[PDB]
Design a protein around this ligand. Structure first.
Ligand SMILES: *C(=O)N1C[C@H](NOS(=O)(=O)O)CC[C@H]1C(N)=O
Ligand SMILES: *C(=O)N1C[C@H](NOS(=O)(=O)O)CC[C@H]1C(N)=O
Ligand SMILES: [Cl-]
Ligand SMILES: [Cl-]
Ligand SMILES: [Cl-]
Ligand SMILES: [Cl-]
Lengths: 243, 242
């Protein structure tokens, strides 16, 4: 059976006084699992998880030459200290540097952004709003299941951009690696339209399988942001995917 | 420029051990070592040779990509992890010699010799069995020459495709967290004296990369854990990793 509900995972949200969904996909078995089939299919603003398609499009169009090209700080002091400094693609992804990605989106422009999101079958494919903010307060929406379908295409180099573009973005997604697993992922935090939600989307590479994941959770304040990873890892540990 | 830091000898002494750690600061273009003579001593690369071997195999099409499966030949060997199917990523991780011996046989002596010349790799001498020269043949490379080769790989400057270089750097991934990424390969030269352990690679930080190459005397497999442990003690002392 393709999609299966595991209500036992709700204990991981309950135990943190949280509400959300975790979706897993077993690539070898071509089967998916979720605590909440309805919420797995509800669409939300992608917020910073949009850095994955934005990175791909920027590299494929040559807006970003490679993962070492330096994007100079514009000398405007912002809220997040790690943003007030020079970045390359690796560090801009790591510190989720919005102003770097805003400039990419402006250089890409509305016409190319729209065509590439259709080509990617990415969420509702709707870029209505400002070209440098639609993933934060515009028309674009994506579900946890639609994140999985996009990431599977990236993993297999099946997106309609160069293999090189896809390999570079997967490098930039690297989050954790040890002798047991590799996680390639991207966090997000949608705050401008209700409900406020946190995301964590990506995959776990094991020796002989890959488990795709997409989670979102209600995030009324920034206090709970560490639960995006903590809850996903509690589910991965339950299912014996990581130790 | 090069500098000797004898204080790192303490990390070797404490584990009753002899060897060398070489570090290269890419931003400053400066090298550091506990032993300048040993930094330039050339040894058999043993399993560290999997780095150039993978590059050549990918560039020639002997390996199509990092997913291609190399089926176990059915010969039961001493290392349990070798007695199973592998791809490039797991073959590097478990250092599966028989997979790399088959690559070498398909590359062949002529293309292997030419490619090591193009890479400026060590003494560029493949004398011996085409499928064992890096374990018991004539090839020799120093810790400083390992760093030279790795800097070219890091910058995509080796004369193979960018794609081959990106795949091998993916396969080298050893560790990553919010502080650092290590891309590296271990080795153990067991067949020709002196028996030594290797660890070569680099640490990626937000705004610098530190290349490293270490080797140490390894009279038995009991001290293999020290290859990483002594290197990490030097990286901590130098405030490169927490
Ligand atoms: C992305 O969702 N954003 C940028 C930055 N990212 O941190 S996250 O990756 O930990 O979610 C701050 C939150 C958010 C934004 N406010 O634009
Ligand atoms: C490579 O040097 N070798 C293959 C294998 N890997 O050990 S490693 O951890 O040093 O990579 C065993 C040692 C050695 C060999 N015996 O050929
Ligand atoms: Cl963003
Ligand atoms: Cl990687
Ligand atoms: Cl080998
Ligand atoms: Cl490439």
């Amino acid at each position: 059976k393709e999609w299966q509900e595991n209500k036992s995972w709700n204990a991981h949200f309950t135990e943190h006084k949280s509400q959300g969904v975790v979706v897993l996909w077993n690539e070898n078995k071509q089967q998916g699992f979720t605590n909440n089939l309805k919420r797995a299919n509800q669409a939300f603003l992608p917020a910073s998880t949009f850095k994955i398609p934005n990175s791909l499009i920027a590299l494929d169009l040559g807006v970003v030459k490679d993962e070492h090209q330096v994007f100079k700080w514009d000398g405007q002091t912002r809220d997040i200290a790690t943003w007030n400094r020079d970045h390359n693609l690796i560090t801009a992804m790591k510190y989720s540097v919005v102003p770097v990605y805003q400039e990419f989106a402006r250089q890409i422009g509305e016409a190319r952004m729209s065509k590439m999101l259709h080509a990617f079958d990415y969420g509702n494919e709707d870029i209505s709003g400002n070209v440098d903010s639609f993933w934060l307060d515009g028309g674009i929406r994506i579900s946890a299941t639609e994140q999985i379908s996009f990431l599977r295409k990236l993993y297999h180099n099946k997106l309609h951009v160069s293999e090189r573009s896809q390999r570079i973005v997967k490098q930039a997604m690297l989050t954790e690696a040890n002798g047991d697993y590799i996680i390639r992922a991207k966090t997000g935090y949608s705050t401008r339209i209700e409900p406020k939600i946190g995301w964590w989307v990506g995959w776990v590479e094991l020796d002989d399988n890959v488990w795709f994941f997409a989670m979102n959770m209600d995030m009324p304040t920034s206090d709970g942001l560490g639960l995006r990873q903590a809850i996903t890892k509690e589910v991965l540990k339950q299912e014996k995917i990581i130790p």
